[PDB]
Amino acid sequence: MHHHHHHSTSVDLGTENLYFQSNAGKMFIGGLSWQTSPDSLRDYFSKFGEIRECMVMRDPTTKRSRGFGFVTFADPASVDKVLGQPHHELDSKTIDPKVAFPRRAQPKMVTRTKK
Template identity: 55%
Template sequence: MPTFATGSYPTVLLDSKMFVGGLNWDTTDEGLRKYFSEFGKVDACTIMRDPDGRSRGFAFLTFDDPESVNAVMIREHYLDGKAIDPKRAIPREEHLRNTRYFVGGLAPTTNAESMREFFSAFGKVVDATVMIDRESGRSKGFGFVTFEDSNNADQFVGKLGLMLDDKQVTDRS
């Protein structure tokens, strides 16, 4: 049964900072930096890694000029043979307004687009993510939805009978 948990996920973010998801496990910090340098000077670039050094499949990067982020956002991106998903990092203040919600118990067929479509009935969705197992490529059965406005939670958190891809959504908070 899908569940929600409210909470903020604070990270220090800047207007010129980006989250890059969907990385090839073999992508290096230097390769990522080189790719994004075509959009502007990259100040920092860090692929997140497990304690054993294996890539977690996502990174954060910061440009010298916030306009570089706009240049990145207007096209699709492929690196090391894989489509990657760069997104504007969400400022810390927005996280603190409880705009991001954990969604658990997702159907195996649920994807980011179906989550976005479902939750758009409750307000403007700025991000929807289904977490994928790196070994199997299958959904882990949970994800996150982020709204533009923190007032959206009142419309669905705690409500019974909400269905997403034939699974009932409930509040776990």
């Protein structure tokens, strides 16, 4: 009665869009350096706790970094340890490592006073 559709022309990978359970637990590392690599971040942060995965935003056009990334800690205790420690130095400069924040809903009424 019902038929399933399949795609034949696929260029991008399909291993991320299936998982929806694991989302929270990541840390957004800001102000990284030009030398800081996802491996460097994993190597540096692995020193505070255990990391599951690391990611640094780069451009395939220039291969240059934007100065921000994330780190996925495999321990809830490491997030606690990092949360208490606000100061983080990398390449002799202070960067902005913080835990992800959720989105909020919208209230009622916008325009109350009409002319």
